[PDB]
Scaffold this motif. Sequence first.
Motif, short mmCIF file in Angstrom:
data_model
loop_
_atom_site.label_atom_id
_atom_site.label_comp_id
_atom_site.label_asym_id
_atom_site.label_seq_id
_atom_site.Cartn_x
_atom_site.Cartn_y
_atom_site.Cartn_z
N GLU A 12 0.82 -1.20 0.00
CA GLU A 12 0.00 0.00 0.00
C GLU A 12 0.86 1.26 0.00
O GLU A 12 0.58 2.20 -0.74
N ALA A 13 1.92 1.28 0.80
CA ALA A 13 2.85 2.39 0.73
C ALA A 13 3.46 2.47 -0.66
O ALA A 13 3.67 3.57 -1.19
N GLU A 14 3.70 1.32 -1.28
CA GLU A 14 4.25 1.26 -2.63
C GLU A 14 3.21 1.74 -3.64
O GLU A 14 3.51 2.59 -4.48
N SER A 15 2.00 1.20 -3.56
CA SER A 15 0.92 1.59 -4.46
C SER A 15 0.68 3.09 -4.44
O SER A 15 0.35 3.69 -5.47
N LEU A 16 0.83 3.73 -3.27
CA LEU A 16 0.58 5.16 -3.10
C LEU A 16 1.82 6.00 -3.35
O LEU A 16 1.76 7.22 -3.17
N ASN A 17 2.93 5.38 -3.75
CA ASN A 17 4.15 6.10 -4.09
C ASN A 17 4.73 6.81 -2.86
O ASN A 17 5.22 7.93 -2.95
N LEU A 18 4.68 6.14 -1.71
CA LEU A 18 5.25 6.68 -0.49
C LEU A 18 6.68 6.20 -0.32
O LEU A 18 6.95 4.99 -0.40
N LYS A 19 7.60 7.12 -0.05
CA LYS A 19 8.99 6.78 0.19
C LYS A 19 9.16 6.42 1.66
O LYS A 19 8.91 7.25 2.54
N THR A 20 9.59 5.19 1.92
CA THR A 20 9.71 4.79 3.31
C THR A 20 11.07 5.22 3.86
O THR A 20 12.08 5.12 3.17
N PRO A 21 11.13 5.71 5.10
CA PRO A 21 12.43 6.07 5.68
C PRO A 21 13.32 4.85 5.91
O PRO A 21 12.85 3.71 6.05
N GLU A 22 14.62 5.12 5.95
CA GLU A 22 15.60 4.07 6.06
C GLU A 22 15.63 3.50 7.47
O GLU A 22 15.25 4.15 8.45
N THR A 23 16.08 2.26 7.58
CA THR A 23 16.25 1.62 8.87
C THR A 23 17.46 0.70 8.82
O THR A 23 17.65 -0.02 7.84
N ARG A 24 18.24 0.70 9.89
CA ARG A 24 19.30 -0.29 10.04
C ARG A 24 19.00 -1.08 11.30
O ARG A 24 19.30 -0.65 12.41
N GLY A 25 18.41 -2.23 11.11
CA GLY A 25 18.23 -3.11 12.23
C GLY A 25 16.77 -3.18 12.62
O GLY A 25 16.01 -2.21 12.50
N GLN A 26 16.37 -4.35 13.09
CA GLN A 26 14.99 -4.58 13.46
C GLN A 26 14.97 -5.77 14.38
O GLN A 26 15.90 -6.61 14.37
N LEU A 27 13.92 -5.80 15.19
CA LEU A 27 13.63 -6.93 16.06
C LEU A 27 12.26 -7.46 15.71
O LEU A 27 11.28 -6.71 15.68
N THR A 28 12.18 -8.75 15.47
CA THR A 28 10.90 -9.41 15.17
C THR A 28 10.58 -10.40 16.28
O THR A 28 11.40 -11.26 16.60
N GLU A 29 9.37 -10.32 16.81
CA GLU A 29 8.90 -11.22 17.86
C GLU A 29 7.71 -11.99 17.31
O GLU A 29 6.59 -11.45 17.19
N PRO A 30 7.94 -13.23 16.86
CA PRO A 30 6.91 -13.96 16.11
C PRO A 30 5.58 -13.99 16.84
O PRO A 30 5.51 -14.35 18.02
N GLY A 31 4.51 -13.67 16.11
CA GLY A 31 3.16 -13.64 16.68
C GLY A 31 2.81 -12.43 17.52
O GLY A 31 1.68 -12.36 18.03
N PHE A 32 3.72 -11.47 17.66
CA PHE A 32 3.50 -10.25 18.41
C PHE A 32 3.70 -9.02 17.53
O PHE A 32 2.75 -8.23 17.35
N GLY A 33 4.89 -8.85 16.94
CA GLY A 33 5.14 -7.69 16.10
C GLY A 33 6.62 -7.48 15.86
O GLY A 33 7.45 -8.32 16.19
N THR A 34 6.92 -6.32 15.26
CA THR A 34 8.25 -5.96 14.79
C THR A 34 8.54 -4.54 15.21
O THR A 34 7.63 -3.71 15.28
#
Length: 119
Positions: free
Chosen positions: A38-60
Amino acid sequence: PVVSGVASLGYEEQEVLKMAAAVEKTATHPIAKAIVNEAESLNLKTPETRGQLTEPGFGTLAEIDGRFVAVGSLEWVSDRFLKKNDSSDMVKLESLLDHKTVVYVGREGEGIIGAIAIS
Protein backbone atom coordinates in the motif's frame (compact mmCIF):
# COMPACT_ATOMS: atom_id res chain seq x y z
CA PRO A 1 -5.38 -9.09 1.98
CA VAL A 2 -5.29 -5.33 1.49
CA VAL A 3 -5.16 -2.20 3.66
CA SER A 4 -8.72 -1.03 4.30
CA GLY A 5 -7.99 2.03 6.42
CA VAL A 6 -5.41 4.03 8.33
CA ALA A 7 -6.33 5.52 11.72
CA SER A 8 -4.23 8.20 13.37
CA LEU A 9 -4.36 10.59 16.24
CA GLY A 10 -2.16 13.65 15.61
CA TYR A 11 -0.36 12.25 12.57
CA GLU A 12 -1.08 12.39 8.89
CA GLU A 13 -2.29 9.05 7.53
CA GLN A 14 0.64 8.96 5.11
CA GLU A 15 3.11 9.37 7.95
CA VAL A 16 1.62 6.42 9.88
CA LEU A 17 1.71 4.24 6.78
CA LYS A 18 5.28 5.36 5.91
CA MET A 19 6.53 4.39 9.37
CA ALA A 20 4.61 1.13 9.41
CA ALA A 21 5.91 0.08 5.99
CA ALA A 22 9.47 1.02 7.01
CA VAL A 23 9.19 -1.41 9.91
CA GLU A 24 7.40 -4.06 7.81
CA LYS A 25 9.82 -3.69 4.87
CA THR A 26 11.15 -7.25 4.69
CA ALA A 27 8.53 -9.16 6.67
CA THR A 28 7.27 -12.10 4.62
CA HIS A 29 3.79 -12.35 6.10
CA PRO A 30 0.82 -11.48 3.87
CA ILE A 31 -0.38 -8.72 6.20
CA ALA A 32 3.02 -7.05 6.37
CA LYS A 33 3.29 -7.39 2.59
CA ALA A 34 -0.02 -5.55 2.27
CA ILE A 35 1.17 -2.59 4.36
CA VAL A 36 4.30 -2.43 2.24
CA ASN A 37 2.32 -2.84 -1.02
CA GLU A 38 0.00 0.00 0.00
CA ALA A 39 2.85 2.39 0.73
CA GLU A 40 4.25 1.26 -2.63
CA SER A 41 0.92 1.59 -4.46
CA LEU A 42 0.58 5.16 -3.10
CA ASN A 43 4.15 6.10 -4.09
CA LEU A 44 5.25 6.68 -0.49
CA LYS A 45 8.99 6.78 0.19
CA THR A 46 9.71 4.79 3.31
CA PRO A 47 12.43 6.07 5.68
CA GLU A 48 15.60 4.07 6.06
CA THR A 49 16.25 1.62 8.87
CA ARG A 50 19.30 -0.29 10.04
CA GLY A 51 18.23 -3.11 12.23
CA GLN A 52 14.99 -4.58 13.46
CA LEU A 53 13.63 -6.93 16.06
CA THR A 54 10.90 -9.41 15.17
CA GLU A 55 8.90 -11.22 17.86
CA PRO A 56 6.91 -13.96 16.11
CA GLY A 57 3.16 -13.64 16.68
CA PHE A 58 3.50 -10.25 18.41
CA GLY A 59 5.14 -7.69 16.10
CA THR A 60 8.25 -5.96 14.79
CA LEU A 61 10.24 -2.98 16.01
CA ALA A 62 12.85 -0.82 14.29
CA GLU A 63 14.49 2.54 14.82
CA ILE A 64 13.22 5.26 12.45
CA ASP A 65 15.12 8.56 12.38
CA GLY A 66 16.36 8.20 15.94
CA ARG A 67 13.18 6.82 17.54
CA PHE A 68 11.91 3.29 17.95
CA VAL A 69 8.62 2.43 16.18
CA ALA A 70 6.68 -0.79 16.82
CA VAL A 71 4.04 -2.48 14.62
CA GLY A 72 1.92 -5.38 15.85
CA SER A 73 -0.84 -6.25 18.25
CA LEU A 74 -2.26 -3.53 20.53
CA GLU A 75 -0.97 -4.86 23.81
CA TRP A 76 2.54 -5.63 22.53
CA VAL A 77 2.94 -2.24 20.81
CA SER A 78 1.59 -0.46 23.85
CA ASP A 79 3.91 -2.40 26.15
CA ARG A 80 7.02 -1.54 24.12
CA PHE A 81 7.22 2.09 25.29
CA LEU A 82 6.96 3.80 28.68
CA LYS A 83 4.76 6.59 27.35
CA LYS A 84 1.12 5.41 27.45
CA ASN A 85 -1.85 6.91 25.64
CA ASP A 86 -4.57 8.86 27.39
CA SER A 87 -7.69 6.82 27.98
CA SER A 88 -9.64 9.26 25.76
CA ASP A 89 -7.26 8.66 22.85
CA MET A 90 -7.77 4.90 23.15
CA VAL A 91 -11.56 5.32 23.08
CA LYS A 92 -11.33 7.63 20.06
CA LEU A 93 -9.06 5.23 18.18
CA GLU A 94 -11.15 2.19 19.01
CA SER A 95 -14.33 4.08 18.23
CA LEU A 96 -13.04 4.79 14.73
CA LEU A 97 -11.94 1.22 14.19
CA ASP A 98 -15.13 -0.26 15.72
CA HIS A 99 -16.78 1.61 12.77
CA LYS A 100 -10.47 -8.00 9.16
CA THR A 101 -7.28 -7.52 11.27
CA VAL A 102 -5.87 -4.35 12.87
CA VAL A 103 -2.13 -3.71 13.11
CA TYR A 104 -1.18 -1.04 15.62
CA VAL A 105 1.61 1.47 15.26
CA GLY A 106 3.50 2.98 18.18
CA ARG A 107 6.47 5.32 18.69
CA GLU A 108 8.79 5.75 21.69
CA GLY A 109 7.96 8.90 23.62
CA GLU A 110 4.40 9.02 22.23
CA GLY A 111 2.77 5.64 22.62
CA ILE A 112 0.21 4.43 20.08
CA ILE A 113 0.08 6.80 17.11
CA GLY A 114 -2.19 4.92 14.72
CA ALA A 115 -3.51 1.68 13.39
CA ILE A 116 -3.83 -0.02 10.04
CA ALA A 117 -6.98 -1.97 9.20
CA ILE A 118 -6.55 -5.00 6.94
CA SER A 119 -9.25 -6.94 5.09
